[PDB]
Amino acid sequence: MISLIAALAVDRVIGMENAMPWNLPADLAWFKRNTLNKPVVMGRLTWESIGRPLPGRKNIVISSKPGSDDRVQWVSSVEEAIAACGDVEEIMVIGGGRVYEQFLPKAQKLYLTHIDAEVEGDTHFPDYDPDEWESVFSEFHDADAQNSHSYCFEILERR
Ligand SMILES: NC(=O)c1ccc[n+]([C@@H]2O[C@H](COP(=O)([O-])OP(=O)(O)OC[C@H]3O[C@@H](n4cnc5c(N)ncnc54)[C@H](OP(=O)(O)O)[C@@H]3O)[C@@H](O)[C@H]2O)c1
Ligand SMILES: CCc1nc(N)nc(N)c1C#C[C@H](C)c1cc(OC)cc(-c2ccncc2)c1
Structure with missing residues (x-):
């Protein structure tokens, strides 16, 4: 099965100047939890944005x-x-x-982190039709010491 996992700022901004315009450890933890023991796939500039593979995972780049x-x-x-x-x-x-x-179109599930911040970016997450997905999981967290902005973890599934 194919799934996408991403952190989304306000109006679907995912990156600026080959980086991510925030730092959230909570979402990092969520990412690590849901990507563990699973294979990961990424594009060139992202791989280059990291430069080091994810431990114990099959890393695939396009x-x-x-x-x-x-x-x-x-x-x-x-x-x-x-x-x-x-x-x-x-x-x-x-x-x-x-x-x-x-x-x-291939994905059957979406792991989304909704970041409550409006910030600057050149790259966006593809517009998906809310007609096409439904929310099976919603976990909201306010901002705190470690987390600069509030956020909501969400799992979506196709219909
Ligand atoms: N907030 C988040 O969840 C998060 C997570 C990851 C990344 N980001 C940000 O998002 C940005 C990356 O997204 P992006 O849209 O710029 O690029 P991308 O989708 O990650 O990478 C596209 C690259 O992959 C190659 N590629 C993709 N599909 C291909 C295909 N079908 N055949 C051959 N090559 C293919 C392309 O090079 P060629 O086709 O020329 O080989 C292209 O350079 C970065 O700025 C990153 O910081 C944010
Ligand atoms: C907030 C990070 C993050 N959060 C959420 N909720 N979804 C995501 N998809 C990502 C992400 C990401 C990018 C694609 C990424 C690619 C990568 O390709 C090797 C390695 C890492 C990474 C290696 C080690 N430590 C932290 C991150 C991150």
């Missing part, structure tokens, strides 16, 4: 250049990227925007 790296599996499209996962129950897509867009 591109049009030769693998500049041997510690990760390189793929050039969507359907063979799924075949690059094998016989798995759940596949994780962690970004970014164009990957989100291409896999959103």
